Amino acid sequence: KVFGRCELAAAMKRHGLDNYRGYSLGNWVCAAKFESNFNTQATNRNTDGSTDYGILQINSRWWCNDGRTPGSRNLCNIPCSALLSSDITASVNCAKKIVSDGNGMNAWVAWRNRCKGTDVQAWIRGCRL
Ligand SMILES: C[C@@H](O)CN1CCN(CC(=O)O)CCN(CC(=O)O)CCN(CC(=O)O)CC1
Numbered sequence: 001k002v003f004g005r006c007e008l009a010a011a012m013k014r015h016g017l018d019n020y021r022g023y024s025l026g027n028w029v030c031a032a033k034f035e036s037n038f039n040t041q042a043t044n045r046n047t048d049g050s051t052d053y054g055i056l057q058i059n060s061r062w063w064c065n066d067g068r069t070p071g072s073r074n075l076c077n078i079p080c081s082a083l084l085s086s087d088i089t090a091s092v093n094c095a096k097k098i099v100s101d102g103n104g105m106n107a108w109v110a111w112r113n114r115c116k117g118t119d120v121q122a123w124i125r126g127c128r129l
Pocket residue numbers: 062073075101102103
């Protein structure tokens with residue numbers, strides 16, 4: 001599923017991601033745009049052989065099982081395919097664990113380089129939320 005901006009904002013808010021760990025909703029929407037272009041089915045292979053999955057490009061090295069990242073962990077206790085569903089619940093629940101792990105949203109490279117320090121409220125501007 002390719003979400004619209006306000007559609008994704010509403011879903012993230014409903015699932016409690018807004019202000020989670022102090023990160024306002026626009027941070028999460030901005031991260032999703034640059035990680036996945038709002039596409040739940042996005043997948044991208046990393047240099048080390050892990051893969052990133054879903055709207056927030058969550059990494060099989062630590063967070064989900066894809067059966068092809070030998071030696072990796074599955075700290076969200078999910079198949080990585082659960083992160084590709086039209087329903088973002090699993091991605092949100094796993095993102096909450098990631099952003100709580102000490103590094104905050106710096107875990108998302110596209111967020112650090114393209115969202116951090118910007119006017120992120122622009123990403124939710126105009127939406128009814
Ligand atoms: C903040 C960094 O630590 C992030 N971290 C980098 C790698 N870590 C480094 C280390 O923990 O020294 C080694 C693996 N780490 C072991 C563990 O955490 O117990 C599991 C994955 N972690 C889970 C987490 O950290 O909550 C996510 C990635």
